[PDB]
């Protein structure tokens, strides 16, 4: 059963339903909200409009009451997020977790459903 997004950073992204645990084995939204908020300075500096959605799609994955399958973001939104924020992250000491490598995401290929909002 899906629950509503409680972490304020991930409110207003397109959906407000999630289900814990997430990909990072966070057992509650409070635990996941503390880790995803470490990227909040990068969101306010506007290095990529896809950053807030890409992070929230991983830390608070979308939960649909009728799908019952993990709906990850596409590889295109991961690349567009890193193309605009990674060079700034390397300067200010931020780092992508290895679990967020864009190769772990489906391509825009096969019947793997992913979530890119510019290709809808």
């Amino acid at each position: 059963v899906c629950q509503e997004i409680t972490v304020p950073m991930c409110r207003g992204i397109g959906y407000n339903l999630t289900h814990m645990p997430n990909q990072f084995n966070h057992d509650t939204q409070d635990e996941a909200g503390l880790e995803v908020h470490q990227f909040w300075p990068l969101v306010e500096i506007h290095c990529s409009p896809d950053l807030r959605f890409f992070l929230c799609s991983m830390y608070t994955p979308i939960c649909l009451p009728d799908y019952h399958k993990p709906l990850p973001p596409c590889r295109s939104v991961c690349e567009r997020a890193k193309a605009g924020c990674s060079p700034l992250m390397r300067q200010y000491g931020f780092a992508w977790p290895e679990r967020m490598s864009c190769d772990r995401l489906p391509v825009l290929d096969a019947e793997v459903l992913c979530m890119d909002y510019n290709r809808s």
Binding site: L34, Q38, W40, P41, G93, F94, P97
Partner: protein, 1038 residues
């Protein structure tokens, strides 16, 4: 897991270093038994006495130019009878040279002035330098301290008294320099230069166009206003400020540098020039710039224009018609107050012969030629036009644009702001006057004074511990203040800033208005302590104070535009001064000038000439009655013997050779550290871990051991360890890491204050501070020896650290990176432990991120402040409750904190820290909990008004981060003739615990390949592996 009992034991080590090795308890007991005399004053008596000192210096300063003026004016009456036309070319005198009292760049002198010729002078020019030598020599011999004295004629000759063979590869066009322009034209000139770079202007003649614009900018003063516009195809103004799109900015060095670089960025364009829009824009700027300057009128507006043959054939006349119409309309809104000057850019073809007629129509504002009727019953200020080629002297042509201005025949002295000397090699200040014979202007006279000499009375004012001084002009710009860099070290003119910014305190704008208006007076105001700067808080003499009184006593300096003020902190409460005492020296006093003595056994202590035989005593420039005389003139063995005799004179018979009040009393009061230190050396086991110990006093006494030679300009009262201890009175102050002056590299300093008595623990009661220095690795060696928990692993997953109240770490599991691979603030808690840094920011009342403005480098700095009243123990509150538990508590009795972290599993945590500069990630807003290492954002100052661009920026001022200091020089002939004072062989140490902390050693861990770990860590001298990286560069050659 336990940290409390571990912290109490760590506090005993801090007391064992402050009390036993340094001698804080002994000196506090001695200073408590001394006798003091109490004084109470509001500053009115002090502002009167200090005003007399600089008034006498300015009176003699004005008597020289007045004397030089009346001699050259009377010398012209002799020119009307006899030919006063001599030639003494400054490039034809090569018998010798000197450097006596300034002029230290190939300067002969003694009754022989020299002349430099401009290309405009004729063979019948007026040259009074023949007889002027008789008075110029008497002016210098009777008034030492003034550098140059010159007379520059209107014809173009430049004669200076100290003849120096300088700049012979060209002509010195002094008539185009700002000192000459501000004298012959003391009116506030609102100039706007329009630079046409359209109509396919050839780059060969745009060269002249952009070069001329640099001559205008480098020829006006801060009371003039300037704007530079482009082709006007699109009216592009200067983009380096928001107000440059609307107003004209005062020609400050900031606006000059911004406009000058904007001039060089101009490249040709093929679009036809839209002249009408450019002149219209210039008017809109001149119109929206307040009523003139609201400043004694004297506001002459001028529009310079640089172009050539635009035409446009079909609409040529239309283009000519649109400009002279909008000129007559906009200058009709004004009362024809705007004058227009035009300049032609020519090669042998483009401009031809008919295109000059359009530029003279613009200078004459010949609108009626095209029909447009002059609606204003007023006349028009007819301008002028000049032609320029690749052979044109831009200084004698476009540089003489001020001649076309009205000469209201003002005969008054004008004083320049501090600027860089073009003849010498330093900063100078110039007073000047014009030379008038009837209705004829002959030129100007001017004398240059060293900036350090004219300000020596306000730079080193130390009459009372409860007072300081600052000097400003009638416009508000600050010439001297405790927050400014000392002038003797400056190689560049500072950013002149209004006093409202350095005296950043609420309710001060009321006192500021009274200072700039009333010529004399005083006023007290009540200020809270939580919103103030350190110059006031460090002089409080009551503990637990929520608000304090301040007394501002000011008085304008007679016959000049400067105003001096005295700030007295808490005047209703007395200030103690050390009474004259008579202590006989138990040991012989040793002045720090070991180079001039050579009598004690010498040795090298890092990059210093030092000795272990006895500690030395130093007097800083400021303890002497003439600090500039002590800095400029050489200190000789004769003077060292005189000062040693007077300071150790117990008979009260030797007269004062040139020292200030309370200087010798503090030398005798601190003379007890000699036997105290030397006794500890014979029994201490920490002789290999202590790089030096010292004690410093407010009036300029500095006793260090090992007794080392220092630079004259060294002021320990402005170092970090001094100011950090004053801010934390009665507490052990950890300060570091910072770069050592003596050559020890990065060091950590324990500092402690000495008070007049133990019953009053306020910062203002500080009569001396003491400090002891250790190497970077020492406090981690202590942390490993004192606390066994820090050894469960090699500082890997279980890590211990010591953090000062600013967030910097002095003890560390890791401290090797210091090179090109890590951020600049890598020694901060936010970079080395980003998780616990994020978590402690959530602990209530523990941390507070601060904002301060630093107008000296136009930046806004972010820092941290953990309040050292932390009672109890702090653990994880938000982050890392499971994977990385930590314990943080204050080391009792000091400003430092001890921390232990137990990393059981990985965790994600970031604190933004730039690895290329110190720029903050987000310069739009500051969040208290957003973890980021110390950083800076560019300060947005409105240069059109002299205030902050955004009023939502009323942060306090960063008091001092004055980095420039002359690190002591060492050279061969001494490096090979002597050896190091302590030579504890680092090659014989085989573990980290044995090598850490040893002052001449370092534990190498990284190979010379940059960042590869070593399979064989070993101990070696610090020269061989800086920061543990074999072959790394010295931190002094960053």
């Amino acid at each position: 897991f336990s940290i409390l009992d571990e912290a109490q034991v760590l506090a005993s080590q801090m007391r064992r270093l402050a009390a036993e090795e340094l001698g804080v308890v002994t000196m506090q007991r001695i200073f408590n038994s001394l006798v003091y005399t109490e004084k109470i004053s509001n500053g009115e008596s002090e502002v009167q006495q200090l005003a007399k000192k600089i008034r006498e210096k300015f009176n003699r300063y004005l008597d020289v130019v007045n004397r030089n003026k009346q001699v050259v004016e009377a010398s012209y009456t002799a020119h009307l009878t006899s030919p006063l036309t001599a030639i003494q070319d400054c490039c034809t005198i090569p018998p010798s040279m000197m450097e006596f009292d300034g002029n230290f760049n190939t300067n002969v002198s003694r009754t022989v002035s020299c002349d430099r010729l401009s290309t405009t002078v004729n063979s019948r020019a007026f040259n009074p330098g023949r007889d002027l030598n008789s008075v110029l020599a008497d002016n210098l011999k009777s008034n030492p301290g003034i550098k140059w004295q010159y007379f520059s004629s209107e014809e173009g000759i430049f004669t200076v008294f100290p003849a120096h063979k300088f700049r012979c590869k060209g002509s010195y066009e002094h008539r185009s320099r700002p000192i000459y322009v501000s004298t012959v034209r003391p009116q506030s000139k609102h100039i706007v230069v329009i630079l046409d770079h359209g109509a396919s202007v050839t780059d060969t003649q745009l060269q002249i166009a952009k070069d001329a614009a640099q001559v205008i900018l480098s020829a006006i003063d801060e009371h003039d206003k300037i704007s530079v516009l482009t082709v006007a195809d699109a009216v592009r103004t200067c983009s380096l400020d928001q107000c440059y799109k609307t107003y004209l900015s005062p020609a400050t060095s900031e606006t000059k540098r911004k406009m000058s670089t904007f001039v060089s960025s101009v490249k040709p364009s093929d679009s036809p020039t839209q002249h009408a829009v450019g002149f219209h824009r210039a008017f809109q700027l001149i119109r929206s710039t307040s009523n003139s300057t609201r400043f004694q009128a004297n506001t002459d507006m001028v529009i310079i224009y640089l172009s050539a043959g635009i035409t446009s054939k079909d609409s040529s006349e239309e283009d000519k018609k649109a400009t002279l119409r909008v000129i007559n309309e906009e200058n009709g809104f004004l009362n024809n107050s705007v004058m227009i000057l035009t300049y032609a850019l020519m090669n042998d073809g483009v401009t031809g012969l008919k295109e000059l007629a359009f530029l003279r129509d613009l200078a004459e504002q010949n609108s009626g030629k095209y029909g447009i009727p002059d609606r204003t019953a007023l006349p028009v200020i007819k301008g002028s036009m000049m032609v320029l080629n690749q052979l044109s002297n831009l200084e004698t042509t476009v540089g003489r644009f001020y001649t076309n201005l009205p000469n209201r025949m003002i005969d008054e002295a004008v004083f320049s702001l501090p600027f860089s000397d073009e003849m010498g090699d330093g900063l100078i200040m110039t007073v000047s006057k014009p030379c008038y014979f009837g209705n004829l202007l002959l030129g100007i006279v001017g004398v240059d004074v060293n900036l350090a000499y004219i300000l020596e009375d306000v730079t080193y004012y130390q009459d009372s511990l409860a007072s300081y001084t600052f000097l400003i002009d009638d416009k508000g710009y600050t010439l001297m203040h405790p927050s400014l860099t000392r002038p003797y070290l400056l190689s560049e003119p500072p950013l002149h800033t209004d006093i409202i910014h350095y005296e950043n305190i609420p309710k001060f704008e009321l006192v500021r208005q009274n200072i700039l208006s009333l010529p004399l007076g005083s006023q007290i105001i009540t200020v809270p302590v939580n919103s103030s700067l350190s110059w006031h808080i460090n002089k409080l003499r009551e503990t637990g104070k929520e608000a304090y009184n301040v007394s501002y006593a000011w008085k304008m300096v007679q016959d000049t535009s400067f105003i001096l003020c005295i700030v007295v902190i808490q005047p209703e409460i007395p200030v103690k001064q050390l009474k004259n005492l008579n202590t006989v020296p138990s040991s012989k006093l040793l002045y720090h000038r070991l180079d001039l003595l050579g009598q004690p056994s010498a040795c090298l202590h890092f990059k210093q000439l030092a000795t272990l035989e006895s500690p030395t005593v130093m007097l800083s420039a400021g303890s002497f009655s003439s600090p500039y005389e002590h800095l400029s003139q050489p200190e000789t063995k004769r003077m060292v013997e005189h000062y040693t005799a007077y300071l150790s004179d117990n008979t009260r018979l030797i007269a004062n050779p040139g020292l200030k009040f309370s200087v010798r009393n503090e030398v005798m009061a601190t003379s007890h550290v000699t036997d105290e230190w030397m006794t500890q050396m014979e029994m201490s086991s920490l002789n290999t871990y202590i790089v030096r110990r010292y004690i410093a006093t407010p009036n300029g006494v500095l006793r260090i051991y090992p007794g080392s030679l220092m630079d004259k300009a060294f002021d320990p009262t402005r170092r970090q360890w001094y100011l950090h201890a004053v801010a934390n009175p009665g507490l052990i102050s950890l300060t570091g890491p910072y770069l050592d002056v003596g050559g020890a590299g990065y060091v950590v300093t324990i500092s402690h204050t000495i008070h007049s008595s133990s019953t009053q623990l306020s910062s203002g009661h500080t009569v001396a501070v003491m400090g002891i220095d250790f190497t970077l690795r020492y406090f981690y060696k202590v942390l490993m020896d004192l606390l066994p928990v820090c050894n469960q692993d090699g500082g890997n997953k279980i890590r211990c650290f010591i953090m000062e109240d600013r967030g910097y770490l002095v003890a560390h599991p890791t401290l090797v990176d210091p090179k090109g691979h890590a951020p600049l603030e890598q020694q901060h808690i936010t970079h080395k432990e980003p998780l616990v840094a994020n978590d402690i920011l959530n602990h209530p009342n523990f941390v507070k991120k601060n904002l301060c403005n630093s107008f000296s480098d136009r930046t806004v700095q972010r820092s941290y402040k953990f309040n050292t009243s932390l009672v109890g123990d702090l653990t994880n509150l938000v982050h890392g409750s499971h994977c990385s538990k930590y314990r943080l508590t204050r080391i009792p009795g000091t400003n430092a904190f001890v921390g232990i972290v137990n990393e059981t599993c990985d965790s994600l945590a970031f604190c933004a820290c730039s690895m290329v500069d110190r720029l903050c990630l987000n310069c739009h807003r500051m969040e208290q909990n957003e973890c980021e290492c110390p950083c800076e954002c560019p300060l947005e100052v409105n240069e059109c008004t002299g205030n902050l661009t955004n009023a939502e920026n009323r942060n306090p001022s960063c008091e001092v981060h004055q980095e420039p200091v002359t690190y002591t020089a060492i050279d061969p002939g001494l490096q090979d003739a002597l050896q190091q004072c302590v030579n504890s062989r680092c090659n014989q140490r085989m573990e980290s615990g044995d090598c850490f902390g040893v002052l001449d050693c370092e534990w190498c861990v990284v190979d010379s390949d940059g960042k590869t770990h070593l399979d064989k860590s070993y101990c070696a001298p610090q020269k061989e592996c800086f920061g543990g990286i074999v072959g790394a560069k010295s931190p002094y050659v960053d």
